[PDB]
Curated annotation (Swiss-Prot):
Changing A255S: In strain: Isolate SZ3. It is found in: Host cytoplasm; Host endosome. Interacts with host PHB and PHB2. Residues 76-122 are annotated as: C2HC. Residues 396-524 form the CoV Nsp2 C-terminal domain. Zn(2+) 2 binds at C29, C32, C47, C50. Changing A471T: In strain: Isolate FRA and Isolate Frankfurt-1. The chain holds residues 295 to 818 of 4382 of the full protein. Zn(2+) 3 binds at C76, C79, H88, C122. This is Non-structural protein 2. It comes from Severe acute respiratory syndrome coronavirus. It comes from the Viruses. Residues 29-50 are annotated as: C4. Residues 164-394 form the CoV Nsp2 middle domain.
Length: 524
């Protein structure tokens, strides 16, 4: 506010070095009829569910952890009104502030959740108040003041009066709301928090929380007498009353409630977008960082609706990247997804789970079909994978390399899919190739490009041979756990790596490494 008065409070050079406090009262919201801790100033509170501004009514209140250079900013009626204006006297503020005050020996004060606030001045038509006295139940928390407060107050006390508060992750470590708002408590801007929240894991959560706080972080699954992080606890609780801006965004995002009603998912998505943008210009990028890079667990409708809308584009991207081609022949997959997204809330959590598979799922491509690696694949995901595999099976045909017929996959580029991996049929000419070619044989040698196991090359003598070919389903690692070593052979015009005692041969790649497709010679 006025620089001289603020500097008598804090060793502060500019009003912007002052940190806003988190104030909240437990009260019902007329619009949503729910009783929730609502963020507020001295007179107005906002529902974190409804998002509607309300008038503070008597109830338990708290100021949360007190930050450095703490202030409570409020719109100034006097500064806003045209007649009185930005220049006004301390007592003229108090007349139109419509904030009832108690007169102490130091001057007018106002109390809130165990802090006594004093008015320093207006600045940019906003009043600044500072806490002249502030309780501490430990870790800077101001405690709760109200009628049935001790039950909650005693829990808070046991976690917080410790020199080092103990964070205990009870199960497996996962990004949920409580973890997010604890990390957010350390970030001076929402933008900064975005970068820190990426690729989060127990170690990084441990190093960050411990470096920047009086915390000790334990992953003992068995719970202790301190702050236990299990699952599904709201960030709308005084223990999570951190005052920073990022924490404020995270608390709002995870508290909004959108009624899915009979709306389709792309409708809820458009609704989600506007709700999220009003919270913060960074919130879309914040949720994206949390969902796509740190495996956020939540049941929030807004967060789920924001990311799962679209979905076809995210699915096409996922498909194009692992098939290495355009996926417009796979049209059936996208119609199905459009259809299920139109169902609305019914499909919402299945959309959520499909998305998470696209991001972190573990599979291989075998005989032109996706094969997942885990049997805890959810029922909604098994159904989705079988939608995809049925679309691929429409694109399956037969290519015949000279000597044998091999399973094809016509996807705007023909791929070979007899075995694990998708193989291009790139032919490079013997001209200039590293290994010397007898040129006895036609220069119709074929390579096949794709996933390649490391190879050792005993001798570079090339050995032509002929006879008919057999296509074999067997994987190379099944017969070769160790790196495969061999001397090249060309049968009818493509390099098949060979070891003589084994009756099997494997195809070669540009760069001369071995591949999964494997063949044998007629009659063994
Ligand atoms: Zn409400
Ligand atoms: Zn004023």
């Amino acid at each position: 506010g006025f620089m001289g008065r603020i500097r008598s409070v804090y060793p502060v050079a500019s009003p912007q070095e002052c940190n806003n406090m988190h104030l909240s009262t437990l009260m019902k919201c007329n619009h949503c009829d729910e009783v929730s801790w609502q963020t507020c100033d001295f007179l107005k509170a906002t529902c974190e569910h409804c998002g509607t501004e309300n008038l503070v009514i008597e109830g338990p209140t708290t100021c949360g952890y007190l930050p450095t250079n703490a202030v409570v900013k409020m719109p100034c009626p006097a500064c806003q009104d045209p007649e009185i204006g930005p220049e006004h006297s301390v007592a003229d503020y108090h007349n139109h502030s419509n904030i009832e005050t108690r007169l102490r020996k130091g001057g007018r004060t106002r109390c809130f959740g165990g802090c006594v606030f004093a008015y320093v001045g207006c600045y940019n038509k906003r009043a600044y108040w500072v806490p002249r006295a502030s309780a501490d139940i430990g870790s800077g928390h101001t405690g709760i003041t109200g009628d049935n407060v001790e039950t909650l107050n005693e829990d808070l006390l046991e976690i917080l009066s410790r020199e080092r508060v103990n964070i205990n992750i009870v199960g497996d470590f996962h990004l949920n709301e409580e973890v997010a708002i604890i990390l957010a408590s350390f970030s001076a801007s929402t933008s900064a928090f975005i970068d820190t929240i990426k690729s989060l894991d127990y170690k990084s959560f441990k190093t960050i929380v411990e470096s920047c706080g009086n915390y000790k972080v334990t992953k003992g699954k068995p719970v202790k007498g301190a702050w236990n992080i299990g699952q599904q606890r709201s960030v709308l609780t005084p223990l999570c009353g951190f005052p920073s801006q990022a924490a404020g965004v995270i608390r709002s995002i995870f508290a909004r409630t959108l009624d899915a009603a009979n709306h389709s998912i792309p409708d809820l998505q458009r609704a989600a977008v506007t709700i999220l943008d009003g919270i913060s210009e960074q919130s879309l990028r914040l949720v994206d960082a949390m969902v796509y890079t740190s495996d956020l667990l939540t049941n929030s409708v807004i967060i789920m609706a924001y990311v799962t809308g679209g979905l076809v584009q995210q699915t096409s991207q996922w498909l194009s990247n692992l098939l290495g081609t355009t996926v417009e022949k796979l049209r059936p997959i996208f119609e199905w997804i459009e259809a299920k997204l139109s169902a609305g809330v019914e499909f919402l959590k299945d959309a959520w789970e499909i998305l998470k598979f696209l991001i972190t799922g573990v599979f291989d491509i075998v005989k032109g079909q996706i094969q997942v690696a885990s049997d805890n694949i959810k029922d909604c995901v098994k159904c989705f994978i079988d939608v995809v595999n049925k679309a691929l099976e429409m694109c399956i045909d037969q290519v015949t390399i000279a000597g044998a017929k091999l399973r094809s996959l016509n996807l705007g580029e023909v791929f070979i899919a007899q075995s694990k991996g998708l193989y291009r049929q790139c032919i490079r000419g013997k001209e200039q190739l590293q290994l010397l070619m007898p040129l006895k044989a036609p220069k119709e040698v074929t390579f096949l490009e794709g996933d390649s196991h490391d190879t050792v090359l005993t001798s570079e003598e090339v050995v032509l041979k002929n006879g008919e070919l057999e296509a074999l389903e067997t994987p190379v690692d099944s017969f070769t756990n160790g790196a495969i070593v061999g001397t090249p052979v060309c049968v009818n015009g493509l390099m098949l790596l060979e070891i003589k005692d084994k009756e099997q041969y494997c195809a070669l790649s540009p760069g001369l490494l071995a591949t999964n497709n494997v063949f044998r010679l007629k009659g063994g």
